[PDB]
Amino acid sequence: DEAEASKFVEEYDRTSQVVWNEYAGANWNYNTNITTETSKILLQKNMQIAQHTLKYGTQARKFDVNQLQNTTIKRIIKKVQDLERAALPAQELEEYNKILLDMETTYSVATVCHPQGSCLQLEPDLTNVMATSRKYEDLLWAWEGWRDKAGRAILQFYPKYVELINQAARLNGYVDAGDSWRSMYETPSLEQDLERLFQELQPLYLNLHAYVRRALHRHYGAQHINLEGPIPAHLLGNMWAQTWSNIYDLVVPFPSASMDTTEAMLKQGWTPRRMFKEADDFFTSLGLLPVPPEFWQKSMLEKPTDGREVVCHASAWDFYNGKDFRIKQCTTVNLEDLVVAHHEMGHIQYFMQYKDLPVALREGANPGFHEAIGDVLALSVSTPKHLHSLNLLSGGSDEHDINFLMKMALDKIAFIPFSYLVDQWRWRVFDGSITKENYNQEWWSLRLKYQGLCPPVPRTQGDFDPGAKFHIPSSVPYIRYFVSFIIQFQFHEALCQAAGHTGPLHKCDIYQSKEAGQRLATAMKLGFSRPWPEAMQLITGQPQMSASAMLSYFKPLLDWLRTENELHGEKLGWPQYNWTPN
Numbered sequence: 356d357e358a359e360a361s362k363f364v365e366e367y368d369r370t371s372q373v374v375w376n377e378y379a380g381a382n383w384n385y386n387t388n389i390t391t392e393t394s395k396i397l398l399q400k401n402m403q404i405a406q407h408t409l410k411y412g413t414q415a416r417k418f419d420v421n422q423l424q425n426t427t428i429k430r431i432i433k434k435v436q437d438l439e440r441a442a443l444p445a446q447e448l449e450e451y452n453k454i455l456l457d458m459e460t461t462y463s464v465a466t467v468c469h470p471q472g473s474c475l476q477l478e479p480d481l482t483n484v485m486a487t488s489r490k491y492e493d494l495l496w497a498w499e500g501w502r503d504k505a506g507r508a509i510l511q512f513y514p515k516y517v518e519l520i521n522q523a524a525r526l527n528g529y530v531d532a533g534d535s536w537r538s539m540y541e542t543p544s545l546e547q548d549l550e551r552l553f554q555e556l557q558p559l560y561l562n563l564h565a566y567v568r569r570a571l572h573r574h575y576g577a578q579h580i581n582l583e584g585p586i587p588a589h590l591l592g593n594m595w596a597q598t599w600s601n602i603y604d605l606v607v608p609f610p611s612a613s614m615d616t617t618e619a620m621l622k623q624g625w626t627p628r629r630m631f632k633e634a635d636d637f638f639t640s641l642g643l644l645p646v647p648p649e650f651w652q653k654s655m656l657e658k659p660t661d662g663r664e665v666v667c668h669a670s671a672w673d674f675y676n677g678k679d680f681r682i683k684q685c686t687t688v689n690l691e692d693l694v695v696a697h698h699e700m701g702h703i704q705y706f707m708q709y710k711d712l713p714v715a716l717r718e719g720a721n722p723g724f725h726e727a728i729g730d731v732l733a734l735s736v737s738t739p740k741h742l743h744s745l746n747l748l749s750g751g752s753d754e755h756d757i758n759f760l761m762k763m764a765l766d767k768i769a770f771i772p773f774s775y776l777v778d779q780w781r782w783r784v785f786d787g788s789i790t791k792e793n794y795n796q797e798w799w800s801l802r803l804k805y806q807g808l809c810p811p812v813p814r815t816q817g818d819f820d821p822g823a824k825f826h827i828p829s830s831v832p833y834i835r836y837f838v839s840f841i842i843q844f845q846f847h848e849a850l851c852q853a854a855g856h857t858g859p860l861h862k863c864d865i866y867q868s869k870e871a872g873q874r875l876a877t878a879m880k881l882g883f884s885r886p887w888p889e890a891m892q893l894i895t896g897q898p899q900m901s902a903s904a905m906l907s908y909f910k911p912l913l914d915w916l917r918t919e920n921e922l923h924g925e926k927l928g929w930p931q932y933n934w935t936p937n
């Protein structure tokens with residue numbers, strides 16, 4: 356028994372490394388060059404890896420885990436027992452694989468065109484409009500158009516997708532796809548734990564929400580903003596109203612208090628490569644790993660100009676040979692994208708840190724950890740002090756302080772309910788309580804309930820707004836981002852302390868702290884070998900997820916906001932919850 360298990364795992368590892376590397380290669384070619392050939396080859400490689408998954412999974416299911424002594428081996432085998440999609444019968448598997456490809460391509464090539472005029476793509480055109488336009492009608496055009504072309508077009512595929520991924524889950528011992536995803540955290544209390552964290556940041560979010568609403572009231576008019584109702588979803592500077600820092604100019608606490616970081620980056624010669632190089636340098640400044648020469652040669656750090664159609668949504672790639680790691684991002688030169696570059700570089704650092712673990716264990720402590728690493732560093736990079744060291748800025752006062760806290764919050768705090776929202780909707784879709792006839796109505800009910808947002812124009816049958824959010828048609832879980840946004844503050848808190856920082860947490864910049872680096876590396880090296888609370892404890896000193904670090908970070912802003920909102924007699928929340936615009 357124990358001997359057969361040790362041998363199975365060794366064989367699984369050497370062969371998975373080969374089969375996974377080959378699949379990644381085909382996946383990469385499709386993602387960076389969407390064509391019928393690359394698509395067809397990716398579909399073919401899907402069956403190859405499925406063959407391998409079916410072969411080893413079947414054998415894994417014959418062993419008896421729990422009657423096995425070694426803990427590492429027991430964990431590896433338990434995992435291999437999950438055939439994920441490879442559990443579906445050949446016909447269903449093929450169909451499923453094709454549906455996923457069709458949704459991904461439909462989303463990545465969608466465009467919104469002006470009658471016999473120009474056609475805009477999501478990146479960089481539509482996203483630039485949402486970020487810079489201050490005209491209600493122009494934002495509406497881009498917001499509605501994107502949902503009309505991308506979301507409406509994903510609808511025809513989704514019910515089948517749901518049917519098939521649920522079927523795969525059931526064949527793997529789960530009750531539905533949501534239950535399967537949820538299990539990646541190995542935490543029985545997960546749903547209640549997350550609900551408690553959400554409720555924790557509620558006071559902070561309702562205050563930020565009220566304050567932003569008043570500012571939008573000021574700029575867009577009383578006729579378009581209800582001071583007691585939800586905010587029209589196209590006005591927050593981001594296509595999904597998931598992060599709001601692009602409307603900072605409309606909400607600046609102390610207008611008399613910074614420069615244009617974009618203009619600085621552009622005139623100072625910043626380019627996508629320089630942006631990734633700066634992230635690389637930040638990691639090595641912490642004693643962490645530099646990316647290999649190969650990374651610079653094979654990555655796609657900007658949208659190609661040779662005519663190639665690509666998947667622009669940012670992603671980091673492990674080719675499972677512990678040498679080849681790459682990023683695929685249609686990077687634009689600006690602070691927001693620099694944060695995203697740092698984020699992707701954290702995924703790469705994780706790949707490099709656990710590259711020596713069996714491939715079954717080359718994963719984050721939990722999916723949230725993988726998402727967090729990168730953001731922890733970007734918090735330091737975002738401080739006024741660090742940005743001035745980068746010459747991107749020409750502060751120091753309390754007003755400057757509140758302004759920085761506001762900027763950060765517009766992103767970090769606003770994202771909490773959005774990130775919470777996405778899988779609440781999908782878990783309900785997967786478990787069957789939300790049928791296709793109600794997909795969109797339920798999405799908006801959640802949009803209203805959690806974010807306090809409303810659609811600027813009524814939605815009609817055939818609308819499928821979730822379809823216009825990458826992760827939905829891409830079938831990428833989303834709760835990981837909610838977890839990340841919470842715990843990255845816990846890690847920042849711990850790293851700042853390990854770096855000897857004193858005073859307000861938001862004034863911390865861990866740049867060049869070897870101690871901070873070592874804190875992370877030790878936990879990053881564990882991959883998925885130990886239960887996540889253990890990685891959590893190594894980094895922070897305790898085993899739980901906690902919203903305290905985040906609250907602590909934003910404490911000064913929470914106090915300022917309460918005072919500011921009370922002075923204007925703001926009514927927190929959206930009492931008049933049925934309100935919709937013009």
Ligand SMILES: O=C(CCC(O)(O)[C@H](Cc1ccccc1)NC(=O)c1ccccc1)N[C@@H](Cc1c[nH]c2ccccc12)C(=O)O
Binds near residue numbers: 671698725730829831
């Ligand atoms: O989706 C992303 C970044 C893309 C990703 O790096 O998370 C990427 C998504 C993906 C997963 C699977 C297939 C294709 C794309 N995930 C990875 O690159 C990745 C790699 C290895 C392990 C885990 C994830 N961010 C989210 C959350 C987000 C919004 N704004 C942000 C600002 C800073 C940090 C995160 C966000 C979003 O844009 O809605």
Ligand SMILES: *[C@@H]1O[C@H](CO[C@@H]2O[C@@H](C)[C@@H](O)[C@@H](O)[C@@H]2O)[C@@H](O[C@@H]2O[C@H](CO)[C@@H](O)[C@H](O)[C@H]2NC(C)=O)[C@H](O)[C@H]1NC(C)=O
Binds near residue numbers: 361364425426427
């Ligand atoms: C449980 O097994 C792990 C893993 O052992 C390795 O993988 C097996 C499939 C087989 O190929 C073995 O020959 C390998 O040694 C043991 O942990 C490893 O320990 C060695 C030596 O300390 C170390 O180099 C590796 O990093 C360890 N790997 C991991 C994942 O921790 C572990 O010692 C065994 N536990 C017990 C109680 O015996």
Ligand SMILES: CC(=O)N[C@@H]1[C@@H](O)[C@H](O)[C@@H](CO)O[C@H]1O
Binds near residue numbers: 677713
């Ligand atoms: C650089 C290297 O060889 N890393 C290997 C890794 O690929 C393999 O999965 C592991 C087996 O547990 O043994 C490590 O030494």
Ligand SMILES: *[C@@H]1O[C@H](CO)[C@@H](O)[C@H](O)[C@H]1NC(C)=O
Binds near residue numbers: 390393661
């Ligand atoms: C894109 O893919 C097509 C089809 O496989 C191929 O002919 C072409 O060479 C690729 N383009 C690049 C830049 O590699």
Ligand SMILES: [Cl-]
Binds near residue numbers: 595820821
């Ligand atoms: Cl939406």
Ligand SMILES: [Cl-]
Binds near residue numbers: 722723833835
């Ligand atoms: Cl997840």
Ligand SMILES: [Zn+2]
Binds near residue numbers: 699702725
């Ligand atoms: Zn990510």
